[PDB]
Amino acid sequence: KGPNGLIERQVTRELLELFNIDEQTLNTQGLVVTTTIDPQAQRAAEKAVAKYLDGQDPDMRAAVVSIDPHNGAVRAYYGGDNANGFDFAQAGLQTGSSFKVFALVAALEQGIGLGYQVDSSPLTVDGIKITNVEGEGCGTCNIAEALKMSLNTSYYRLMLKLNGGPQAVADAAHQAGIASSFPGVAHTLSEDGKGGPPNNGIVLGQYQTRVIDMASAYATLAASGIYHPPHFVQKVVSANGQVLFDASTADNTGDQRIPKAVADNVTAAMEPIAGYSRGHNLAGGRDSAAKTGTTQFGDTTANKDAWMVGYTPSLSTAVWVGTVKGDEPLVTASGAAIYGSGLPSDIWKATMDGALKGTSNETFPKPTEVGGYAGVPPPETVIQPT
């Protein structure tokens, strides 16, 4: 069946929850279910994956989820190639340097603006040395620049400035739409596993999160802080045409999870990142807001997971690349390590370009001020001899 079968499994799970029935009952009713999938987006995601994984190591894997920020509809969903196999778009995965976007949300919510300056040098805290996986430093620079350069050190210091520290980061992530639980994880972003607080590694993307969670949380940002629960079912009709559910008819205001000024300043900091990240601006001069991620393998100089998550006002797409075993250096066929700015960014760009083909280029709202800064700070008579 293909990627199609993974979509069918999510749709089924959603219907079971909607109707409070078991699968045996569902499958004998003769229902016709319209999904949220956009064919054009779905094909673009599938093509992009095949193009960039073609000829690589067969243990390489990817997952792609695209959500409409206007309503939470899942427009494209790629969890793997096998209908009855594993769905990497629901796996608990480390997010590495992409997670620190939530620390930026947390900081802006406490009135710290994009111009706030922080040291980016290496840091040691409780015996652990903290350095930047992507290998950049700026001395001291503003937190917008630190986001673009993926400065984990800066954001670790920023987190420790916040009221609540790592809990502020988890609270912002959860509010954005990172789910509080999923299968295999009863309490996300919790060190004890029971609802207790995270440790400092949250800002380093060390907790497990799903690709669908990242696409959804970034969609909240894309919608100026309005959250919509992600869903796969658009409409359900009975065997003889009675509408039993229709997402179109429901109360489609969302919930204001993040204040608009905060979300719009996050977007402003993220706008340059696609182009900065090895020239992955969207085709045709279309603006975007994006964030790369890489996780470190063990405490080596190798990488394990690589991410690109980014959006326009009309689509938010998260892309992960890793390996099926999850226990080995992430490298291309050339031998080189995979960072978020490489293959996951290739896939994100191709997916988004193909999904948004046939639409005009949108622009982002002008941000208003937070902590004294609105958006990213911008960059004789001669007599001789005597």
CA-to-CA distance for 385 and 201, rounded, in angstroms?
A: 64
DSSP 55: T
Instruction: Give the number of other CB atoms < 10 A from CB of residue 109.
Output: 19
Which amino acids are annotated catalytic? 97
Compute the C-alpha angle 69/67/257, nearest 5°: 45
CA-to-CA distance for 95 and 211, rounded, in angstroms?
A: 9
318, β-bridge pairs:
65, 309
The structure was resolved to a resolution in Å of: 1.8
Q: Is 286 exposed, middle or buried (0-12, 13-18, 19+ CB in 10 A)?
A: middle
Instruction: Give the number of other CB atoms < 10 A from CB of residue 250.
Output: 9
> How does DSSP assign 322-372, residue by residue?
EESS--S--B-TTSPBP-TTTHHHHHHHHHHHHHHTTSPPP-PPPPPPBTT
Exposure letters 318-333 (e unless 16+ CB within 10 A, then b): bbbbbbeeeeeebbbe
Alpha helices in 149-231 (DSSP H): 152-161, 166-176, 211-222
**Tokens linked to 304:** 């394990």
**Tokens linked to 360:** 């005009």
290, β-bridge pairs:
310
Beta-carbon contacts of residue 66 (< 8 Å; ≥ 6 apart): 41, 45, 74, 75, 76, 77, 215, 315, 316, 317, 351, 352, 355
Q: Which amino acid is at 261?
A: A
Question: For residue 227, how far is the Cα from the chain centroid?
Answer: 14
CA-to-CA distance for 321 and 342, rounded, in angstroms?
A: 10
Q: Are 284 and 354 in contact (CB under 8 A)?
A: no
Block residue for tokens 């182009």: 275
140, β-bridge pairs:
119
HEC readout, 132-155? CCCCCCCCEEEHHHHHHCCCHHHH
Q: Are 376 and 144 in contact (CB under 8 A)?
A: yes
CA-to-CA distance for 10 and 381, rounded, in angstroms?
A: 76
Q: Are 110 and 121 in contact (CB under 8 A)?
A: no
CA distances in angstroms from 176 to 148, 258, 364, listed in the order given: 20, 7, 18
Nearest one of 105, 99, 87, 181 to 133, comparing CA atoms: 99
Q: Is 249 exposed, middle or buried (0-12, 13-18, 19+ CB in 10 A)?
A: exposed
Which structural domains are found in the chain, ordered by start?
A: 1-386 (3.40.710.10)
- Helix (H) / strand (E) containing 265: helix 260-270
